[PDB]
């Protein structure tokens with residue numbers, strides 16, 4: 001029941017992700033070395049990862065079918081609201097349930113719950129973040145469902161500051177319809193059962209996470225010495 | 241709206 005267009009969309013998104021996301025994590029060396037001793041020692045290294053991740057998210061977003069039609073202001077707005085949520089979403093592939101930590105192929109790159117704390121984030125943001133990763137991981141979504149989820153997240157009509165709600169909504173719906181249709185046609189029971197609703201629920205979780213992150217960022221970022229550690233891209237994307 | 245780096249990247 002998948003139109004040729006729907007199959008095309010999946011192929012584009014999958015391609016977009018592969019270019020956007022590197023399984024090797026080879027680029028990580030370029031970030032300021034991780035410091036695990038010490039308040040805020042993790043933040044320089046994490047900021048760099050986040051900054052790097054923002055660039056990758058932006059590059060994925062642009063490839064999304066119909067995203068380019070949006071006005072510059074609508075594209076910028078979607079990304080700023082979206083970008084933290086996509087990083088948590090994308091970061092799921094690195095996240096391992098065994099150790100309960102994001103794993104980047106090396107001991108230094110592997111990130112503890114404490115490492116996140118070390119950046120300057122309280123458990124209230126972090127515990128919910130870990131639960132989210134567990135709950136998303138549990139879904140064991142196909143790569144196609146993972147890519148589509150990220151795309152649907154980015155193209156949200158209800159994002160704050162969106163000049164044209166109707167256009168964003170039209171793009172998203174095509175992605176939603178693709179995703180629903182994919183689960184039915186390409187996803188077998190019993191794992192498929194409720195999967196669309198469960199995925200949509202994750203977007204509600206991300207909104208909560210986003211809001212929390214923003215409050216915690218503002219406290220950390222309010223301090224000029226801590227803000228100084230953040231990258232320019234981070235300040236622009238997460239600040240304003 | 242004062243997003244030079246984001247805007248350029250999207251470009």
Ligand SMILES: C=C1[C@H](O)CC(=C/C=C2\CCC[C@]3(C)[C@@H]([C@H](C)[C@@H](CC)CCO)CC[C@@H]23)C[C@H]1O
Nearest residue numbers: 046053087088090091094102111116119121213
């Ligand atoms: C390429 C990627 C992603 O962009 C980011 C990856 C993991 C994501 C992580 C691990 C460390 C803690 C991170 C960076 C969180 C940072 C520290 C958040 C904490 C709420 C701070 C935002 O200012 C968000 C996503 C988390 C590795 C890998 O999957």
